[PDB]
Amino acid sequence: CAVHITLDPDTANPWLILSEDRRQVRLGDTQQSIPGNEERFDSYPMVLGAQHFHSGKHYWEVDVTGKEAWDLGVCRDSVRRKGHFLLSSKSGFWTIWLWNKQKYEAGTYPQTPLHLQVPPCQVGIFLDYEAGMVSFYNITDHGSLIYSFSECAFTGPLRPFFSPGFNDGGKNTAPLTLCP
């Protein structure tokens, strides 16, 4: 069920730099000047996969090597794009995140701390639509389960969700890379 993900530049916050092949994204030093369109996330450095999931099983892996912060998973296509919101399962985002170098958490509401013995350099994301399951795997630790969201009971199409961090004038400029 391994799927070739590509990043949708129409969704990408101006703080983001996408590679030419749209297989990579990183935080930029400054905001790019880019057309204001309704699909674009305007308040946080977030971008979606081009791919839409209506059903079935879907798997992809991401390199997070050298990063102090990131967020990965899946969201409803219907999520609001403009203004401020909370990354939570209750808001249509099924994600895990790193921040402050070592704080791993699942984006439940309220959030669930994760205790990772081996810090992941690559993360696997498995979506099972009919099961209502989004699962996260520690590829560095031989595929151990990081976290699973269960009985999410999805209605509409879902999208891959990425953020290579938030802008804090910090050093978190290494890219997220989609693994071949």
Give the span between the Cα atoms of 34 and 59, in whole angstroms: 31
- For residue 159 the two structure tokens come to 């999208």
Selected binder of ligand A1EMT within 10, 23, 28, 44 (CB under 6 A): 44
CA quadruple 63, 65, 67, 73: dihedral, nearest 10:
20
Selected binder of ligand A1EMT within 53, 60, 70, 126 (CB under 6 A): 70
* Token pair 């791993």 in the structure block, residue: 104
**Helix %, strand %, coil % of the chain (to 5):** 0, 40, 60
Selected binder of ligand A1EMT within 60, 163, 176, 177 (CB under 6 A): 163
Selected binder of ligand A1EMT within 25, 45, 96, 158 (CB under 6 A): 45
27 binds ligand A1EMT (CB under 6 A): no
Stretch in the footprint of ligand A1EMT (CB under 6 A) among 43-51, 118-126, 128-136, 151-159: 43-51
Residue showing the smallest CB distance to ligand A1EMT in the complex: 163
Q: How far is the CB of 92 from ligand A1EMT (least distance, A)?
A: 12
DSSP at 166: -
146 binds ligand A1EMT (CB under 6 A): no
* φ and ψ at residue 22, rounded to 5 degrees: 55, 30
Selected binder of ligand A1EMT within 92, 120, 124, 165 (CB under 6 A): 165
Give the span between the Cα atoms of 84 and 125, in whole angstroms: 25
Stretch in the footprint of ligand A1EMT (CB under 6 A) among 2-10, 123-131, 134-142, 160-168: 160-168
Give the span between the Cα atoms of 121 and 123, in whole angstroms: 7
Q: How far is the CB of 168 from ligand A1EMT (least distance, A)?
A: 8
Give the span between the Cα atoms of 130 and 11, in whole angstroms: 26
Under the rule (CB under 6 A), what is the footprint of ligand A1EMT?
Answer: 44-46, 69-71, 86-87, 97, 99, 163, 165-166
